[PDB]
Amino acid sequence: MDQSNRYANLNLKESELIAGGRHVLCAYIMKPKAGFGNFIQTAAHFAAESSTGTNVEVFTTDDFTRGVDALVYEVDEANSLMKIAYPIELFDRNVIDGRAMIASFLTLTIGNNQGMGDVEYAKMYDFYVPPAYLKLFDGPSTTIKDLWRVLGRPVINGGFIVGTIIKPKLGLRPQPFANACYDFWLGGDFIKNDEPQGNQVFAPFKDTVRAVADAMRRAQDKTGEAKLFSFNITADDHYEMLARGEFILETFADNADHIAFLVDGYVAGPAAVTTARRAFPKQYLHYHRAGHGAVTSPQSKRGYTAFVLSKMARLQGASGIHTGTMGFGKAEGEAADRAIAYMITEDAADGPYFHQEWLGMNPTTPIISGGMNALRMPGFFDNLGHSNLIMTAGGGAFGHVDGGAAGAKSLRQAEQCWKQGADPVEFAKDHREFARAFESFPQDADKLYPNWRAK
Amino acid sequence: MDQSNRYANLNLKESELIAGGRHVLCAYIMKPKAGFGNFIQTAAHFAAESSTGTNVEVFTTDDFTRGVDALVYEVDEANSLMKIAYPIELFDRNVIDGRAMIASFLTLTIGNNQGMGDVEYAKMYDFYVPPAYLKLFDGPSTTIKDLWRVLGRPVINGGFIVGTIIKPKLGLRPQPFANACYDFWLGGDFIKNDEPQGNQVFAPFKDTVRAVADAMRRAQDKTGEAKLFSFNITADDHYEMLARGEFILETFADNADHIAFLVDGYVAGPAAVTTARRAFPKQYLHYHRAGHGAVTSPQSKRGYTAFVLSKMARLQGASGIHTGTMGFGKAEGEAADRAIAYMITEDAADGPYFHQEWLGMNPTTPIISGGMNALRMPGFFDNLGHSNLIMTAGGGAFGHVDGGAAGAKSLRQAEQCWKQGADPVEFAKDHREFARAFESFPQDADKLYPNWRAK
Amino acid sequence: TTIKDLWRVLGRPVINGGFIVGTIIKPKLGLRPQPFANACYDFWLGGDFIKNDEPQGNQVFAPFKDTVRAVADAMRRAQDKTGEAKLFSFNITADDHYEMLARGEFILETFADNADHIAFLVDGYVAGPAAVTTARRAFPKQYLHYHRAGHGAVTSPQSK
C-alpha cells in the first residue's frame, strides 16, 4: 500500500516547522529493503508506523486522526536521509503531574519502525524538541556545580574532577574494596563503583557501603580535602533502588552530600533513571550507559547514535553521562564526539541536523571514561577544549606501578600539564607520579611520546 | 595485552559446567576487528570486560577475584562462535528480598562488551541459567489460564483468544475509541491499547478508561460473553504506572479481573516491567517489545536475538510477550521462530545452543501480532502447531470491509478452519466474515489462495 | 506460593517432590536467642524444615531481631556443614498490619541470599482472615504457612 499522499509533505519548510513550535523533528539514515516500495513510499510507511497508522487502511480513521499524522517533510535519497515531523500532541504525558516521558518519545520515534519488513535499516542521528515539549521534561536537578561546591572549588568553571573506578570490576571483598578507595582518595577526588558492583554474595552491599564510608572519613582526616563516591543503586525493582539510596545517605550522614548515585540507564532503562532523579533530586545522578554500543556503534545502521542517547539523558535528568573518550581511549568513539559534550553542557548547541535551545535547562556533565590514563589525557583535552568535567581511570589508576594514590596524582598532574600548555615529556621531569605513568603504560608512552626514555 | 591464559580455559567441558550448576553460560557470534588480537585473545578480553577485568593489569587483583572470572570455554572461529561461563556469584541480588535482577545479567553479559574497540561485533544467541540462579527470578504470576478462566474456557488447552489493537494508533478521542472497542467485542475476546496510547491531550487517560469500561459492560450485556482489555500503563515514573493501574482496577470494579496491563518493556526497560509484575501480580502482564528490532533484527550483528529477549521476559515475569508472526506477517521474522514460543511455554526446551529446564516456572504466552489477518492465520498455525495463544490483528480487524465485529469473526473463523483441517477457500463458502476477509485484503488472497474469486 | 517453591529450594523434583522433614522448636516459649538457634542447627543436621512454635515472636526474653539473626547464622552453619538447603517458617502474626510488614521485611533482608528459604507463619484463626491477607498480598513470593490455633473451639465434633 502506497501511503505517501497522506504521510509525506515535502513542501513543508523545516524553518516554519521549527518556528511553529508544534512538532518534534527526527532525522534518520534509512535504506528501503529491495523489492518493496521506493524511498518516499517506504519513508511514508515509516511515518505511519511511528504515529497514527498501520500497513493497511482502517475504516476507523477520521479527519481528527489525519491532523496528528507524523509527516515526512524532507528526503535526500542519495545520502539515505529522511526527516519526519511529529505533532507534539502524539506524545504521552503523566496523569499525576502533566509532565513528559522519554518512553513515549522512544516508542513512537524509534519503536516498531525498527522491525519493519520493507526497511533494510533506519537509525536516528538527531532530534529537535520545541519549547512546549522541552519544558515538560525533568531535566537535571543536580550538576557538577554541586560537586565543585563540596570540593571547595569555584562553582563557575571549578575545573577537573580527578576520578577512578574500583578495579577489579568484581571480586574485591568489602575491606580490600575500601582499602583501594582510601589509597586513591589520598591523591584523587572521585570514585565510582564499577557498573555491576552492588550486593554480590562475596561483597554484600551494606558491608561495602559501611567500609567505604569509613575509608572516606579516614582519607578526609588524612588529607584535609573532601572526597566523593558514586554508588551503583541500579535494580529492576524500584523499591530496591530506594532501599540502597536511603541506606547510603543515612550511613554517610554528615558526608551524605559527597554521594552521587550511579544508574545503568541503558540496560535498566529510563524507568530506573527516573526513579533516582525523582526520589533523590539533591544527589548527583550519574548515568552509566553499559550496553549502548549494541545500537550506537557506527558498525550499527539501526536504533540511534550516542549523540541522540546523550541528548535524551539531559531531558531525563542525568547530572552526568558517559560520553566516551572521543577516540583517545579503548572504546569506539571519534574526535567529532566533542559535539556531544557541547550539546549536553551548553544552553544552545548544534547537532548534526538540528540546532537546540535548552531554555535554561541544567547541563549534564560529560563523564570521560574507557582506557584513559595520564599519558592519553593531554591529547583528549586538546580535542575537547576544556577540563570542566569528571574523568574516571580504573586501569589508569590501579595499573600505576606505584599504587592508587600515585595513579590518582598522575591524572591530576596530566591535566595540570595540559592547563599549563607544557610539553608532557618536559613536564614529567619535575612530576614523578606523571613520569612513572610512562613506565606503567610503556606501549602507550612509545606510541604517544617516542623518545621518552632518553629524556 | 594478551589475557587468554587467565580468561580462557578451552579444556572446561560444557556438560560439567551445566552439571555443576554454578555458571550462567552465554553463546555469542563474534568477529574481532582487524589489526588487534586473534580470536581467542579477543574472546578473553571480551570475558574480562564482562566480569572482573579491564584492558590492562591492575595491582588490586587477588586470587579470590581470579576465582570469579568469566571464562571462554569453547570457541569455533570458522563459525564465529564464542561461549563464556559466568560464575553465578558475579550477578547482583536485591538487598530487600535476595532475588535476582535481569539488569545485572544484561550489564555483565551484553553491557560494556558492546563498545569494545577491538571487536567488530558480538551478538548473544542463547544463554543457560542453572537452578540456583533461575529460582531467584520472579517468573510469571499470571498466565493465559487466568484469561481462559475469565472467558469460561477450560484452564488446560482453553484455546485461541481472538484479539485486536485499536486503530488508528493515535487520534481517536475517548468515545470514538470506546465505540471501536464495543464493535470489535461483539465478535471477539481481547483488545489491547496500541503501544503509544495513554494520556494524550486529545484522549485523556481517565476519560478513555471510563469510556472503555462502559463499552465492556455494554458488549458483555449484549453478547453474554466476557471481554478482555490490555491497557498501556507504561511511564518513566514508577508512581505514574501505579496511578494508571490503580485507577483502571477501581474503575472496572467487578470487571477488574478482565484487565491486562501492557508495558513497553524494551524502551521503558526491565525496571518498568518489574514495577507492573510486583505491584499488580494478579493482573496479566502484557510485555510489548517496541524498539527491539534495533538489536534483534538479523540485519544487526550486535546485542541479542529475539529468542534471548523472550527468554529473559519469562524470567522477568511477563504473562505474555510478543514473539512476532514467524515470517507470516508484516515484520521481520522466520518460521524457525516457533522455537521461541516453545522455550517460553514449555517446562523444558531447546535453544539454539542450550537446553533449559524451567523447574515449574510459569509459562509466558506467545502473543502473535504484526500485519496478521484471517487469510494469513492458517499458515501461521500450521508452522506453530497449536492455537493456545493470543493473536492481535489491528489492520486485520479494522480493515475488514464489513466492520470491526465482522473483522473479529473472520479471525475466529480462520482458527476454526485451521482446527477443523479444512481448505480455507472451501471453508469460506460457508463462513461469510472469513469470505469477506478475501475481498478486504485481495492482494494477500491472490498470493495465498490464487483462484479464490472463481470459488 | 506452593510446596513446589519449597521442593525447588531443596533441589527436589517440582512435581511430586516428596516429604519435607520438619519440626517445631520446643520449649514452646522459654528459649533465649542462642539456645533457640542451637536447637535449630541441631535439627537441621538431619532435617529440612523448622517452624516457630505458634506464639514465639518478640518476647522480652527472646527479642525478635536477636532471634531472627541467630537463626540466620544457624541456617548458614547447617547448610555449610551438610551441603543441603534448610527452611524456616517464622511467625509474623500481629494485630497491627504494619508490625506484620516490619517483621517480614526484617527477616528477608537478614536472610539475604537465603531469603527464598523463608516461609511466613500466620495464626489465621485467632488473628483472622485480615492477618492472612496481609501476608498473602504483602509477601506473595514467600510460602504462607497458615497456623489454625484456636479452631478447635468450633471445628471439634463435640461442637454442634
Ligand SMILES: O=C(O)[C@@](O)(COP(=O)(O)O)[C@H](O)[C@H](O)COP(=O)(O)O
Ligand atoms: O568498566 C569499564 O570499562 C569502565 O569502568 C572503564 O574502566 P577503565 O578505566 O579501566 O577502562 C567504564 O564502565 C567504561 O568506560 C564504560 O564505557 P563508556 O564510558 O564509553 O560508556
Ligand SMILES: O=C(O)[C@@](O)(COP(=O)(O)O)[C@H](O)[C@H](O)COP(=O)(O)O
Ligand atoms: O502497532 C503495530 O504495528 C501493532 O499494533 C500491530 O498492528 P497491526 O495488526 O495493524 O499490524 C503491534 O504493536 C506490532 O505488531 C508490534 O510488533 P511485534 O509483535 O513484532 O513486537
Ligand SMILES: [Mg+2]
Ligand atoms: Mg565500568
Ligand SMILES: [Mg+2]
Ligand atoms: Mg501497536
Ligand SMILES: [Mg+2]
Ligand atoms: Mg505449636
